[PDB]
Amino acid sequence: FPATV
Amino acid sequence: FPATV
Amino acid sequence: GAMGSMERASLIQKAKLAEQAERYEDMAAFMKGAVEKGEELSCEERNLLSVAYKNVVGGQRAAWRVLSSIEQKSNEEGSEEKGPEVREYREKVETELQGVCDTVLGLLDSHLIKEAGDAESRVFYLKMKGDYYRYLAEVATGDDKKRIIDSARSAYQEAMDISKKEMPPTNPIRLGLALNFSVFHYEIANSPEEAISLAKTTFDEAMADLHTLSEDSYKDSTLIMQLLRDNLTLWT
Amino acid sequence: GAMGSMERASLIQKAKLAEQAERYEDMAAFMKGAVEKGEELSCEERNLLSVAYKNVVGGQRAAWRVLSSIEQKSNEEGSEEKGPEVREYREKVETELQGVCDTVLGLLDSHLIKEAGDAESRVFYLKMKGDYYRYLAEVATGDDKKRIIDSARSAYQEAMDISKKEMPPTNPIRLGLALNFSVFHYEIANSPEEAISLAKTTFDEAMADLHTLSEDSYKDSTLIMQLLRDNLTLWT
Ligand SMILES: CC(C)(Oc1ccccc1)C(=O)Nc1cccc(-c2csc(C(=N)N)c2)c1
Ligand SMILES: CC(C)(Oc1ccccc1)C(=O)Nc1cccc(-c2csc(C(=N)N)c2)c1
Ligand SMILES: [Mg+2]
Ligand SMILES: [Mg+2]
Ligand SMILES: [Mg+2]
Ligand SMILES: [Mg+2]
Ligand SMILES: [Mg+2]
Ligand SMILES: [Mg+2]
Numbered sequence: 001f002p003a004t005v
Numbered sequence: 006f007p008a009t010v
Numbered sequence: 011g012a013m014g015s016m017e018r019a020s021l022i023q024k025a026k027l028a029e030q031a032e033r034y035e036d037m038a039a040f041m042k043g044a045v046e047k048g049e050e051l052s053c054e055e056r057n058l059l060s061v062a063y064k065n066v067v068g069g070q071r072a073a074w075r076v077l078s079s080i081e082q083k084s085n086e087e088g089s090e091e092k093g094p095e096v097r098e099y100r101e102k103v104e105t106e107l108q109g110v111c112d113t114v115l116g117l118l119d120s121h122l123i124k125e126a127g128d129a130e131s132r133v134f135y136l137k138m139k140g141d142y143y144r145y146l147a148e149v150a151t152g153d154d155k156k157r158i159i160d161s162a163r164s165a166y167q168e169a170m171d172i173s174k175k176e177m178p179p180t181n182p183i184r185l186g187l188a189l190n191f192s193v194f195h196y197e198i199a200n201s202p203e204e205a206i207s208l209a210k211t212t213f214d215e216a217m218a219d220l221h222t223l224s225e226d227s228y229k230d231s232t233l234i235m236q237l238l239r240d241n242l243t244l245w246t
Numbered sequence: 247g248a249m250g251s252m253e254r255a256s257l258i259q260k261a262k263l264a265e266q267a268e269r270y271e272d273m274a275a276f277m278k279g280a281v282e283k284g285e286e287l288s289c290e291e292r293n294l295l296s297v298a299y300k301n302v303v304g305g306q307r308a309a310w311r312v313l314s315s316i317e318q319k320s321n322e323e324g325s326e327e328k329g330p331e332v333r334e335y336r337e338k339v340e341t342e343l344q345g346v347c348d349t350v351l352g353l354l355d356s357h358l359i360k361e362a363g364d365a366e367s368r369v370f371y372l373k374m375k376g377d378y379y380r381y382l383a384e385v386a387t388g389d390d391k392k393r394i395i396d397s398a399r400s401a402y403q404e405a406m407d408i409s410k411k412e413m414p415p416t417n418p419i420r421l422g423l424a425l426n427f428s429v430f431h432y433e434i435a436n437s438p439e440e441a442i443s444l445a446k447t448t449f450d451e452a453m454a455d456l457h458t459l460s461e462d463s464y465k466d467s468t469l470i471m472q473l474l475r476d477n478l479t480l481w482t
Contacts, residue, residue, distance in 0.1 A: 031309035
């Protein structure tokens, strides 16, 4: 999965 | 801590 | 509320203890109680709220993905019928996840967003609104899926508009908002080109503003810049 | 019981799904429901029960240790008074931990142990009884602490006596029982010499029986033997 914050 | 199972 | 009898300061103190103990469900319940005291949240308190619920929903999302993958395989050609149990348990986890998202969205609507006037609070809460609608969209399959997606988009867009007017391009809230809205475009809205464009423009505009920053601010901004680059590398 | 309406086989199936999703609280609730159907548990089912509760209580123990350490520091000379919150929250986690242990002990007493006649089931359940009394002893400080310690000792001792009569020295249940009873001696009963003697004798008697085993049984036994050696190295 892509990065999120 | 020591090992337990 | 079961936290109604506990002092606001005690709830915040216990949220910090819960974090140290990796008790994120407790942390979230303490922060929900703090929000329900009715006072605005400081910067630190906003981040305690977000850390707590992000960890809770993150675990639910990971579990939902495991169960959804098992369910998908059970529905492939040649797979032995095993009964309703996989669907039932995926639905149970999904309903709990939706409940957490609804709780967070309810705190934002009653009444965190309406009282948030400074850019750092308002952008933060609108980012959260976009994020929790995005988590609802990840599991949505019914008549309201398009409206859920549009609710996420609308919240992210309002946050973006404020952040571009009121924050420097290196502000970590602005950067994290752009990171997540870019992921929304890629994973939810079927808009990979928009996702890539947003990540690249955000990165480049932040790069150009790094020269204005102290060493500590530089560290904070470059950390999120690297996540933008990581996604760009994944997508190109 | 909230699981009373669900089929036994469905509870077991969902326990396995919960494990895959790392949802150990759910796993434990499903296995509690399965036990409460009243039938004896197969070997696989016994291990699902133990895995579920071991993970739940293990997380509670880790959190309790973090909070207890913070509490101890708050009570040192020169530490600023911060109010009752650390003690209160440590007590909250402790009470939840005790509740889980009481639940497991209740399942063993109603009625898993009394129906367990084969060594592999009876030793397994008595080991569990010793383990959960040991977890209660870790947090005990009151009038009943000695009785809690003695309850752990008594359960472990009955399991040991059966295991030595009825199982080979390489049996993994026998080995894990000895490992844990040795830790009980070291950490609970203030008996490090007994702990070391038990670990060493168990290891040496298992070594001498490895020649009787298949490759797969050898792997299972040597894995627990290495844990005995690891503890011996820590203690000597
Ligand atoms: C901002 C950043 C880099 O990334 C984003 C971006 C946009 C939105 C959210 C995060 C981040 O990661 N963290 C962050 C920032 C400022 C304060 C705190 C904090 C106070 S207290 C506390 C805790 N954990 N006890 C943590 C944490
Ligand atoms: C026995 C051993 C090596 O160690 C001990 C020792 C004494 C007591 C307990 C463990 C162990 O670790 N595991 C073990 C053994 C036999 C069966 C299963 C099992 C069935 S199903 C399942 C699951 N996880 N879905 C796991 C697991
Ligand atoms: Mg007050
Ligand atoms: Mg549903
Ligand atoms: Mg644009
Ligand atoms: Mg039936
Ligand atoms: Mg107590
Ligand atoms: Mg002896």
